[PDB]
Amino acid sequence: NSTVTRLIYAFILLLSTVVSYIMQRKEMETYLKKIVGYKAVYRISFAMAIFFFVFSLLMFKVKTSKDLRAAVHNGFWFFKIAALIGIMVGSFYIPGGYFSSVWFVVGMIGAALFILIQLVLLVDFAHSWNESWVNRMEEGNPRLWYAALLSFTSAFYILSIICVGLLYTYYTKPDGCTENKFFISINLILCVVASIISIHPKIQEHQPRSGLLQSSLITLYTMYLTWSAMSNEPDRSCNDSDNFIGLFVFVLCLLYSSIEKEGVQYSYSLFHLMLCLASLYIMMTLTKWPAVWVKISSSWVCLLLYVWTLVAPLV
Amino acid sequence: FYSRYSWYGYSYGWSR
């Protein structure tokens, strides 16, 4: 039932995200003006953030379902929704202007933190996947699981190669957009290096089940990040599918996170904190130099974190 | 078992 509750919370966030997306359209500018699109998106994102932060602080140090607060987490969906609407209306009551830039910087920091946390989660998920499938390779029919592992890793690497091809075709020119070339070349070379480090026998000796699969997954995620950094480039010479793909990967990570008297399966407080950071990140994404530099540094932090998770046992 | 440094990790399934 706890997993069901986590999935339902993810569902409410997804519904709010879809609402934010739809108001982003030009047609809705007519309706909202009657009370721009980015302003309403900021308002709804602030509602998400404040609600989730409030619930997480409420859920502090809860350790058993015997807590009435555990029931509050489980039930009262209707009161949750009503309080959310009341908050969202309240957001409209805050004056515009300086609040816009304040929330923009708050959203930048939130998106950075969410990217970091989601990335740690992604590395953990990839490691668990690789270990489970190598174990099933050992115990059960070796051929089936070997074929599955090879197909998955090859698929991820081929998709990353296709993304590289598209980015070279679109965001680079023979004698132009040198920033695009720099970013793409650095990301590709560092991804190759990360793959190599994932095979070095000394590294595996300390992490026996660290293999190419998680490397390819990280490479695909890095390719997506770097692409996204380019699509927002203000310079049109160096400049929705990328954001849709990012939303898909975020949904996958949220589902992984989602998937009692003596102990709780997960800290509701920390889960809701992650949810709030997810709201901030989506708010940043759906929409400037900080976006570009944040995304590029996020890709580089991706590769650094993966390399660190692989190497730290060496130290 | 003859565990070996295979690409998919450090295992012995291929050489049990």
Count of pairs with CB atoms under 8 A, one residue in A, one in B = 46
- Please report, to the nearest 10 degrees, the dihedral formed by the alpha carbons of residues A167, A172, A177, A183 taken in order: 40
Contact status, residue B7 vs residue A196, Cβ threshold 8 Å: no
CB within 8 Å: B10 and A204:
yes
Q: Which residue of B has its CA nearest to A137?
A: B13
Interface test with B, best of A141, A154, A157, A199 (most B CBs within 10 A): A199
Question: This structure's resolution (angstroms)?
Answer: 4.4
Phi then psi dihedrals of residue A96, to 5 deg? -85, 175
Phi then psi dihedrals of residue B10, to 5 deg? -115, 95
Q: Is B10 helix (H, G, I), strand (E, B) or coil?
A: strand
**Cα–Cα distance for residue pair A124/A118, rounded to 1 Å:** 10
Residues in chain A: 315
Place of tokens 């009435």: A68
Contact status, residue A17 vs residue A282, Cβ threshold 8 Å: yes
Residues in chain B: 16
Place of tokens 């089936």: A144
**Cα–Cα distance for residue pair A131/A116, rounded to 1 Å:** 23
Structure tokens at A194: 């990360």
Which of A142, A153, A201 lies closest to B14 in CB terms?
A: A142
DSSP structure string for chain A: -HHHHHHHHHHHHHHHHHHHHHHTSHHHHHHHHT--HHHHHHHHHHHHHHHHHHHHHHTTT---TTSHHHHHHHS-HHHHHHHHHHHHHHHHTS-SSHHHHHHHHHHHHHHHHHHHHHHHHHHHHHHHHHHHHHHHHHHS-HHHHHHHHHHHHHHHHHHHHHHHHHHHHHH-BTTB-HHHHHHHHHHHHHHHHHHHHTT-HHHHHHSTT--HHHHHHHHHHHHHHHHHHHHT-SSGGG--HHHHHHHHHHHHHHHHHH---S--SS-HHHHHHHHHHHHHHHHHHT--HHHHHHHHHHHHHHHHHHHHHHHTTT-
**Chain A residues inside the 8 Å CB shell of B4:** none
Per the entry, the structure determination technique was cryo-EM
**Chain B residues inside the 8 Å CB shell of A153:** 8
Phi then psi dihedrals of residue A305, to 5 deg? -65, -40
| Chain breaks after residues in chain A, where C lies over 2.5 Å from next N | 35, 239, 259, 287
Q: Which residue of A has its CA nearest to B16?
A: A138
Residue A194: exposed, middle, or buried by beta-carbon count in 10 A (0-12, 13-18, 19+)? Answer: buried
Phi then psi dihedrals of residue B5, to 5 deg? -80, 75
Structure tokens at A109: 């920091």
Handedness of CA A233, A234, A237, A243 (dihedral sign): positive
- AA identity, residue A163: C
Question: In sequence order, what are the residues at sequence separation of 6 or more whose Cβ sits closer than 8 angstroms to the Cβ of residue A160?
Answer: A191, A216, A219, A220, A223
